Write a protein that binds this DNA or RNA. Structure first.
Lengths: 238, 230
RNA sequence: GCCCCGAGGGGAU
């Protein structure tokens, strides 16, 4: 039931590098969860951010077994030097007291209040796979299919079809503000950063509930492709 | 034949043209003498302009004489203005061409469009403000095929609509003040068609050139969807 | 762009 996003507060210069962060993360699992590398839907997501001198990394876990297996290892890293591309000292491992740290449960994603609208902030470059070509436009179905798919893959609930068809086929965009930035790990790829407000016309109370739930879930799962490299870090706003 | 024109009316007077006033003014001109035209307006307050895009020869032959006859006259486009000049060139949004010249090339797999007024599309009964490749390019292609002498082979259409991705996007949605509950995109988008054949690339570049005249998306008759290739 | 999976996803510093 638990969802967790733990933030590593880092000491050192520069920021974590996507590939190094992912390598560091997968290094912790090759012991205790060798299987997650090959699975087609990741039960985790990585991120990083901050200004120079105030860098941080983040590990989001969408399944309980992983939290159990990994959280003890992460806490044991406090005060130690790790490599996330460049070397850093893990000052603290935070569940609370950081904007991108948090814990919840899957049922709690569904405690509303419901809303016809969903304002998503994309905080790192976000893009999607179509036909083996990356696409940076945060269209409603891409975003919400991305969220819904994983919510279901790892949560205890799936949506009634009415709700789903509403979410994916009927959700529109009310406003969009932002720009694309290069995804440095990829070839000829950029990703959207900014704010998009989605709206579901004729939304039932239920539909609105689920929309809000996908919104809340995004904080943990991220959106789109290559969340294992820190892309698609997003959260709901008002 | 196959003339294409975008004539700019540079204005003397305070304020800016209003969409409804401008379209009404144009509608008048239509009696007296897809839409085979588009309208636009812009500039700073006090240095405003309006523009009339004519996509078919008949309408040019019929309307150009009326617009030129307004030089130095007062017109109402919401606020009152004196028409300083009617320009087919010498202004960034004025121009004349022909449909064949739209295919002059060079062909290119990239197309950078600037959306200079709010741009949106009619979708399932609602207005949608996101400049998706399929929407932008379908809009342009539909109009180009409506008024031009050529039609894209089906495979080309398919490539353009389904394969074109976005290399970069920068901008924001702004309210469409004439509308209810509608916003439109303003900014810059660079479209890219991977592995475009020569023909596909040629068509992409031609749609790009046609945009200057037709505009993109819904309600171009109110000045929305004003755009150009960069 | 390449491999794998199957609207889109995964890819061990």
């Amino acid at each position: 039931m638990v969802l967790a996003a733990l933030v590593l507060v880092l000491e050192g210069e520069g920021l974590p590098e996507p590939l190094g962060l992912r390598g560091f993360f997968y290094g912790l699992l090759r012991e205790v969860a060798p299987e997650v590398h090959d699975q087609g839907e990741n039960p985790f997501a990585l991120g990083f951010g901050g200004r120079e001198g105030a860098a941080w990394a983040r590990v989001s876990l969408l399944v309980e077994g992983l939290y159990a297996r990994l959280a003890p290892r992460l806490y044991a890293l406090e005060g130690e030097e790790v490599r996330l591309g460049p070397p850093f000292r893990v000052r603290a491992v935070l569940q609370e007291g950081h904007p991108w740290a948090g814990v919840s449960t899957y049922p709690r994603l569904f405690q509303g209040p419901p809303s016809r609208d969903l304002a998503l902030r994309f905080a790192s470059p976000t893009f999607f796979r179509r036909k083996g070509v990356h696409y940076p436009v945060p269209e409603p179905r891409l975003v919400l299919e991305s969220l819904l798919r994983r919510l279901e893959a790892f949560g205890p609930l799936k949506a009634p079809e009415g709700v789903r068809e509403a979410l994916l086929e009927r959700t529109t965009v009310r406003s969009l503000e932002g720009r694309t930035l290069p995804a440095r790990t990829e070839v000829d790829t950029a990703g959207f950063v900014g704010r998009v407000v989605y709206h579901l016309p004729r939304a039932t109370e239920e539909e609105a509930l689920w929309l809000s739930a996908l919104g809340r879930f995004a904080f943990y799962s991220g959106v789109g492709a290559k969340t294992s490299l820190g892309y698609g870090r997003a959260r709901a706003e008002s």
